[PDB]
Protein backbone atom coordinates (compact mmCIF):
# COMPACT_ATOMS: atom_id res chain seq x y z
CA UNK A 1 0.00 0.00 0.00
CA UNK A 2 2.74 3.14 0.27
CA UNK A 3 3.81 4.16 -2.98
CA UNK A 4 5.80 7.42 -4.18
CA UNK A 5 5.41 8.76 -7.91
CA UNK A 6 9.18 8.71 -8.54
CA UNK A 7 10.68 5.32 -9.59
CA UNK A 8 13.45 4.62 -11.01
CA UNK A 9 14.05 4.62 -14.40
CA UNK A 10 14.23 2.09 -16.85
CA UNK A 11 17.01 1.83 -19.04
CA UNK A 12 19.11 4.86 -17.11
CA UNK A 13 22.45 5.57 -18.69
CA UNK A 14 24.45 7.80 -16.09
CA UNK A 15 26.70 8.79 -18.61
CA UNK A 16 23.97 10.17 -21.48
CA UNK A 17 22.02 12.01 -19.16
CA UNK A 18 25.07 13.78 -17.61
CA UNK A 19 25.95 15.05 -21.97
CA UNK A 20 22.30 16.14 -21.56
CA UNK A 21 22.54 18.23 -18.56
CA UNK A 22 26.40 19.99 -19.61
CA UNK A 23 24.60 20.31 -23.20
CA UNK A 24 21.46 22.25 -21.32
CA UNK A 25 23.79 24.86 -19.18
CA UNK A 26 26.87 25.32 -21.71
CA UNK A 27 26.98 28.33 -23.40
CA UNK A 28 25.00 31.75 -22.89
CA UNK A 29 21.92 30.31 -21.28
CA UNK A 30 20.12 27.74 -20.07
CA UNK A 31 17.51 24.97 -21.03
CA UNK A 32 16.04 25.15 -18.02
CA UNK A 33 12.94 22.80 -20.03
CA UNK A 34 15.99 19.79 -20.51
CA UNK A 35 16.92 19.79 -16.83
CA UNK A 36 13.34 19.53 -15.23
CA UNK A 37 12.25 17.10 -17.37
CA UNK A 38 15.23 14.82 -16.92
CA UNK A 39 15.92 15.57 -13.01
CA UNK A 40 11.89 14.36 -12.26
CA UNK A 41 12.34 11.03 -14.49
CA UNK A 42 15.20 10.11 -12.37
CA UNK A 43 14.95 8.13 -8.89
CA UNK A 44 16.85 10.20 -6.18
CA UNK A 45 19.88 7.07 -6.60
CA UNK A 46 20.01 7.66 -10.05
CA UNK A 47 20.33 11.56 -9.55
CA UNK A 48 23.55 10.79 -7.65
CA UNK A 49 25.15 8.62 -10.27
CA UNK A 50 24.40 11.14 -12.74
CA UNK A 51 26.15 13.94 -10.72
CA UNK A 52 29.08 11.94 -10.54
CA UNK A 53 29.26 10.79 -13.91
CA UNK A 54 28.86 14.58 -14.90
CA UNK A 55 31.92 14.81 -12.47
CA UNK A 56 34.16 12.41 -14.08
CA UNK A 57 33.61 13.59 -17.56
CA UNK A 58 33.76 16.79 -17.22
CA UNK A 59 35.22 18.00 -13.61
CA UNK A 60 32.61 20.01 -12.71
CA UNK A 61 30.24 19.90 -9.63
CA UNK A 62 26.71 19.29 -11.14
CA UNK A 63 24.87 21.12 -8.46
CA UNK A 64 27.40 24.00 -8.30
CA UNK A 65 26.84 24.57 -11.94
CA UNK A 66 22.62 24.17 -11.72
CA UNK A 67 23.22 26.63 -8.32
CA UNK A 68 25.29 29.00 -10.94
CA UNK A 69 22.29 28.76 -14.15
CA UNK A 70 19.17 28.57 -11.78
CA UNK A 71 17.36 31.05 -9.88
CA UNK A 72 14.72 31.39 -7.23
CA UNK A 73 12.10 28.84 -5.94
CA UNK A 74 13.15 26.81 -9.10
CA UNK A 75 16.85 26.42 -7.91
CA UNK A 76 15.45 25.78 -4.05
CA UNK A 77 13.37 22.84 -5.74
CA UNK A 78 16.28 21.40 -7.91
CA UNK A 79 18.85 21.41 -5.09
CA UNK A 80 16.02 20.03 -2.62
CA UNK A 81 15.64 16.74 -5.25
CA UNK A 82 19.89 16.34 -5.72
CA UNK A 83 20.45 16.04 -2.02
CA UNK A 84 20.81 12.21 -1.09
CA UNK A 85 17.69 11.11 0.09
CA UNK A 86 19.58 10.13 3.29
CA UNK A 87 20.87 13.69 3.89
CA UNK A 88 17.47 15.27 3.07
CA UNK A 89 15.55 15.38 6.42
CA UNK A 90 18.71 16.13 8.37
CA UNK A 91 19.53 19.07 5.90
CA UNK A 92 16.21 20.18 6.70
CA UNK A 93 16.44 20.13 10.55
CA UNK A 94 20.32 21.46 10.60
CA UNK A 95 18.71 24.60 8.46
CA UNK A 96 15.61 24.87 11.12
CA UNK A 97 18.04 24.64 13.97
CA UNK A 98 20.25 27.19 11.92
CA UNK A 99 20.48 31.07 13.33
CA UNK A 100 19.44 32.46 15.80
CA UNK A 101 15.92 31.54 16.63
CA UNK A 102 14.06 27.82 15.19
CA UNK A 103 11.98 26.71 13.00
CA UNK A 104 9.27 25.03 14.64
CA UNK A 105 7.16 23.80 11.98
CA UNK A 106 10.01 21.83 10.51
CA UNK A 107 10.98 20.31 13.66
CA UNK A 108 7.23 19.23 14.70
CA UNK A 109 6.43 18.23 10.97
CA UNK A 110 10.09 16.05 10.56
CA UNK A 111 10.19 14.53 13.79
CA UNK A 112 6.45 13.60 14.61
CA UNK A 113 5.69 12.43 11.38
CA UNK A 114 9.26 10.43 10.81
CA UNK A 115 9.26 6.66 11.73
CA UNK A 116 11.43 4.94 14.64
CA UNK A 117 13.80 3.63 12.35
CA UNK A 118 13.87 6.77 9.80
CA UNK A 119 14.42 8.79 13.29
CA UNK A 120 17.48 7.18 14.01
CA UNK A 121 18.75 6.66 10.22
CA UNK A 122 18.65 10.96 10.26
CA UNK A 123 20.44 11.13 13.67
CA UNK A 124 23.07 9.09 12.08
CA UNK A 125 23.06 11.07 9.06
CA UNK A 126 23.15 14.07 11.09
CA UNK A 127 26.25 13.16 13.14
CA UNK A 128 28.25 12.13 10.35
CA UNK A 129 27.40 15.45 8.42
CA UNK A 130 27.22 18.16 10.44
CA UNK A 131 29.65 16.75 13.33
CA UNK A 132 26.91 17.88 16.43
CA UNK A 133 24.31 15.13 18.16
CA UNK A 134 20.84 16.40 16.65
CA UNK A 135 19.06 16.06 20.40
CA UNK A 136 21.94 17.93 21.89
CA UNK A 137 20.83 21.17 19.00
CA UNK A 138 17.12 20.63 19.72
CA UNK A 139 17.57 20.63 23.05
CA UNK A 140 19.44 23.70 23.02
CA UNK A 141 17.15 25.36 20.44
CA UNK A 142 13.58 25.09 22.52
CA UNK A 143 12.40 24.38 25.91
CA UNK A 144 9.91 23.21 28.06
CA UNK A 145 7.70 20.62 27.44
CA UNK A 146 7.56 21.05 24.05
CA UNK A 147 11.21 20.13 24.58
CA UNK A 148 10.79 17.17 26.29
CA UNK A 149 8.18 15.50 23.40
CA UNK A 150 10.88 16.43 20.89
CA UNK A 151 13.37 14.32 22.93
CA UNK A 152 11.51 11.69 23.50
CA UNK A 153 9.98 11.00 20.20
CA UNK A 154 14.46 11.66 19.13
CA UNK A 155 14.61 8.19 20.66
CA UNK A 156 13.43 6.50 18.38
CA UNK A 157 11.80 3.81 20.83
CA UNK A 158 8.31 3.46 20.51
CA UNK A 159 6.64 0.21 21.52
CA UNK A 160 6.20 -2.18 18.61
CA UNK A 161 3.09 -2.73 17.43
CA UNK A 162 1.79 -6.53 19.33
CA UNK A 163 -1.34 -8.42 20.50
CA UNK A 164 -3.79 -5.10 22.23
CA UNK A 165 -4.42 -5.64 25.56
CA UNK A 166 -8.45 -3.81 25.80
CA UNK A 167 -7.68 -3.43 29.96
CA UNK A 168 -4.40 -1.84 28.72
CA UNK A 169 -6.74 0.73 26.43
CA UNK A 170 -9.01 1.38 28.73
CA UNK A 171 -6.27 1.79 31.37
CA UNK A 172 -4.61 4.60 28.97
CA UNK A 173 -7.87 6.16 27.82
CA UNK A 174 -8.88 6.49 31.32
CA UNK A 175 -5.08 7.74 32.68
CA UNK A 176 -5.33 10.82 29.60
CA UNK A 177 -8.88 11.44 30.69
CA UNK A 178 -7.83 11.88 34.88
CA UNK A 179 -4.90 13.15 33.05
CA UNK A 180 -6.55 16.60 31.10
CA UNK A 181 -10.02 17.11 31.23
CA UNK A 182 -10.74 16.47 34.95
CA UNK A 183 -7.85 18.04 36.26
CA UNK A 184 -7.30 21.66 36.63
CA UNK A 185 -4.42 22.46 34.65
CA UNK A 186 -2.88 19.22 32.42
CA UNK A 187 -0.13 16.42 33.57
CA UNK A 188 1.60 17.42 30.18
CA UNK A 189 4.24 14.34 31.50
CA UNK A 190 1.40 11.82 31.42
CA UNK A 191 0.25 13.15 27.64
CA UNK A 192 4.04 12.59 26.39
CA UNK A 193 4.37 9.43 28.07
CA UNK A 194 1.40 7.62 26.53
CA UNK A 195 1.75 9.57 23.02
CA UNK A 196 5.76 9.56 22.38
CA UNK A 197 6.06 5.75 23.90
CA UNK A 198 2.81 3.38 23.00
CA UNK A 199 2.39 1.64 20.06
CA UNK A 200 0.93 2.92 16.81
CA UNK A 201 -1.86 0.28 17.04
CA UNK A 202 -2.20 0.62 20.61
CA UNK A 203 -2.98 4.70 20.43
CA UNK A 204 -5.49 4.30 17.66
CA UNK A 205 -7.62 2.00 19.97
CA UNK A 206 -6.83 4.41 22.73
CA UNK A 207 -7.95 7.40 20.61
CA UNK A 208 -11.59 5.65 20.00
CA UNK A 209 -11.75 4.44 23.62
CA UNK A 210 -11.32 7.92 24.54
CA UNK A 211 -13.66 9.18 22.79
CA UNK A 212 -16.45 6.58 24.24
CA UNK A 213 -15.37 7.81 27.80
CA UNK A 214 -15.46 11.52 27.24
CA UNK A 215 -17.25 12.51 24.19
CA UNK A 216 -14.22 14.28 22.94
CA UNK A 217 -11.60 13.02 20.18
CA UNK A 218 -8.22 13.58 21.66
CA UNK A 219 -7.46 16.38 19.37
CA UNK A 220 -10.34 18.20 20.64
CA UNK A 221 -8.79 17.66 24.38
CA UNK A 222 -5.76 18.50 23.37
CA UNK A 223 -6.66 22.03 21.74
CA UNK A 224 -8.54 22.67 24.80
CA UNK A 225 -5.90 21.50 27.10
CA UNK A 226 -2.78 23.23 25.71
CA UNK A 227 -1.34 25.89 23.61
CA UNK A 228 1.30 26.77 21.32
CA UNK A 229 4.26 24.48 20.42
CA UNK A 230 3.36 21.96 22.55
CA UNK A 231 -0.16 21.84 21.52
CA UNK A 232 1.25 21.72 17.59
CA UNK A 233 3.26 19.28 18.63
CA UNK A 234 0.54 17.11 20.31
CA UNK A 235 -1.40 17.36 17.38
CA UNK A 236 1.29 16.55 14.47
CA UNK A 237 1.69 13.30 16.96
CA UNK A 238 -1.91 12.10 17.09
CA UNK A 239 -2.69 13.42 13.27
CA UNK A 240 0.48 10.90 12.36
CA UNK A 241 -0.39 7.90 14.63
CA UNK A 242 -4.01 8.06 12.66
CA UNK A 243 -2.01 8.13 8.92
CA UNK A 244 1.03 9.73 8.35
CA UNK A 245 -0.28 10.17 4.19
CA UNK A 246 -3.34 11.89 6.13
CA UNK A 247 -1.05 14.29 8.44
CA UNK A 248 1.23 15.10 5.22
CA UNK A 249 -1.71 15.88 2.67
CA UNK A 250 -3.01 18.58 5.54
CA UNK A 251 0.31 20.46 5.78
CA UNK A 252 0.41 20.22 1.98
CA UNK A 253 -3.16 22.06 2.01
CA UNK A 254 -2.59 24.81 4.41
CA UNK A 255 0.91 25.57 2.88
CA UNK A 256 -0.75 26.40 -0.43
CA UNK A 257 -4.37 27.61 0.60
CA UNK A 258 -3.74 30.87 2.05
CA UNK A 259 -3.02 34.01 0.24
CA UNK A 260 0.56 33.06 -0.59
CA UNK A 261 2.39 29.43 -1.05
CA UNK A 262 4.45 28.31 1.61
CA UNK A 263 7.01 26.80 -0.95
CA UNK A 264 9.75 25.97 1.74
CA UNK A 265 6.96 23.31 2.75
CA UNK A 266 5.82 22.59 -0.75
CA UNK A 267 9.39 22.01 -2.01
CA UNK A 268 10.13 19.40 1.47
CA UNK A 269 7.08 17.42 1.34
CA UNK A 270 7.11 16.51 -2.06
CA UNK A 271 10.90 15.77 -2.48
CA UNK A 272 11.06 14.07 0.86
CA UNK A 273 8.16 11.63 0.18
CA UNK A 274 8.48 11.62 -3.80
CA UNK A 275 9.50 7.99 -3.21
CA UNK A 276 7.50 6.75 -0.21
CA UNK A 277 4.21 7.78 0.16
CA UNK A 278 3.42 10.75 -1.92
CA UNK A 279 0.75 8.61 -3.70
CA UNK A 280 -1.02 7.83 -0.83
CA UNK A 281 -0.46 11.79 -0.03
CA UNK A 282 -2.73 12.23 -3.38
CA UNK A 283 -5.24 10.39 -2.48
CA UNK A 284 -5.54 11.57 0.74
CA UNK A 285 -5.40 15.12 -0.27
CA UNK A 286 -8.47 14.59 -3.07
CA UNK A 287 -10.78 12.33 -0.34
CA UNK A 288 -10.57 15.22 2.14
CA UNK A 289 -10.25 18.68 0.76
CA UNK A 290 -12.18 17.83 -2.48
CA UNK A 291 -9.30 19.10 -4.70
CA UNK A 292 -6.64 17.07 -6.60
CA UNK A 293 -3.06 17.80 -5.60
CA UNK A 294 -2.19 18.52 -9.20
CA UNK A 295 -4.93 21.45 -9.32
CA UNK A 296 -3.97 22.90 -5.75
CA UNK A 297 -0.80 23.63 -7.27
CA UNK A 298 -1.22 24.12 -10.85
CA UNK A 299 -3.11 27.07 -9.28
CA UNK A 300 -0.75 28.07 -6.76
CA UNK A 301 2.57 27.99 -8.68
CA UNK A 302 4.27 29.41 -11.93
CA UNK A 303 7.26 28.55 -14.38
CA UNK A 304 9.70 25.84 -14.74
CA UNK A 305 9.19 25.48 -10.81
CA UNK A 306 5.34 24.76 -11.60
CA UNK A 307 6.23 22.40 -14.69
CA UNK A 308 8.77 20.51 -12.24
CA UNK A 309 6.85 20.27 -9.40
CA UNK A 310 3.66 18.61 -11.43
CA UNK A 311 5.39 16.06 -13.11
CA UNK A 312 6.75 15.05 -10.04
CA UNK A 313 3.33 14.87 -8.25
CA UNK A 314 1.48 13.28 -10.86
CA UNK A 315 -1.90 12.40 -10.93
CA UNK A 316 -5.27 13.96 -12.19
CA UNK A 317 -8.17 12.87 -9.45
CA UNK A 318 -5.30 13.11 -7.22
N1 LIG B 1 -3.12 22.87 30.36
C1 LIG B 1 -2.81 23.78 31.40
C2 LIG B 1 -4.24 24.37 31.44
O1 LIG B 1 -5.39 23.44 31.16
P1 LIG B 1 -6.77 23.77 31.79
O2 LIG B 1 -7.82 24.05 30.83
O3 LIG B 1 -7.26 22.62 32.60
O4 LIG B 1 -6.37 24.94 32.67
C3 LIG B 1 -7.16 25.92 33.39
C4 LIG B 1 -6.17 26.98 33.89
O5 LIG B 1 -5.18 27.17 32.86
C5 LIG B 1 -5.44 26.61 35.19
O6 LIG B 1 -4.59 25.48 35.03
C6 LIG B 1 -2.03 23.53 32.74
O7 LIG B 1 -1.45 22.49 33.11
O8 LIG B 1 -1.80 24.43 33.50
CA1 LIG C 1 24.87 28.68 -19.22
CA1 LIG D 1 16.22 29.61 -20.40
CA1 LIG E 1 21.43 30.73 -8.39
CA1 LIG F 1 18.88 28.37 16.59
CA1 LIG G 1 10.41 30.16 16.25
CA1 LIG H 1 16.96 25.15 25.47
CA1 LIG I 1 -7.56 20.28 32.63
CA1 LIG J 1 0.68 21.33 33.91
CA1 LIG K 1 -5.23 25.51 22.45
CA1 LIG L 1 -2.23 30.20 -2.15
Given at each position: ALRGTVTDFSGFDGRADAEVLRKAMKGLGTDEDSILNLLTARSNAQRQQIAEEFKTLFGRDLVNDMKSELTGKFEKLIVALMKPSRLYDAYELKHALK????DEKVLTEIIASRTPEELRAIKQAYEEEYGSNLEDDVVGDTSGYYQRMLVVLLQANRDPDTAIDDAQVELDAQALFQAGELKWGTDEEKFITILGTRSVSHLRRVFDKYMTISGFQIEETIDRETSGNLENLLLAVVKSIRSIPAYLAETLYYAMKGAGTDDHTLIRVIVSRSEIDLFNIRKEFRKNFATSLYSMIKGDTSGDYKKALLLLCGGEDD
Amino acid sequence: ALRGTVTDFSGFDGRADAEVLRKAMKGLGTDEDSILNLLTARSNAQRQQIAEEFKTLFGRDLVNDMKSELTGKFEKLIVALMKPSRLYDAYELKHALKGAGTDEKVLTEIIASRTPEELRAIKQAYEEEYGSNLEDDVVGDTSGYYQRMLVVLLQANRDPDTAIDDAQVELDAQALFQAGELKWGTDEEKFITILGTRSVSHLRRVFDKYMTISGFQIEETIDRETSGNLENLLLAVVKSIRSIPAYLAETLYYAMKGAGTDDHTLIRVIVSRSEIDLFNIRKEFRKNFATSLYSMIKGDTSGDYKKALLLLCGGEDD
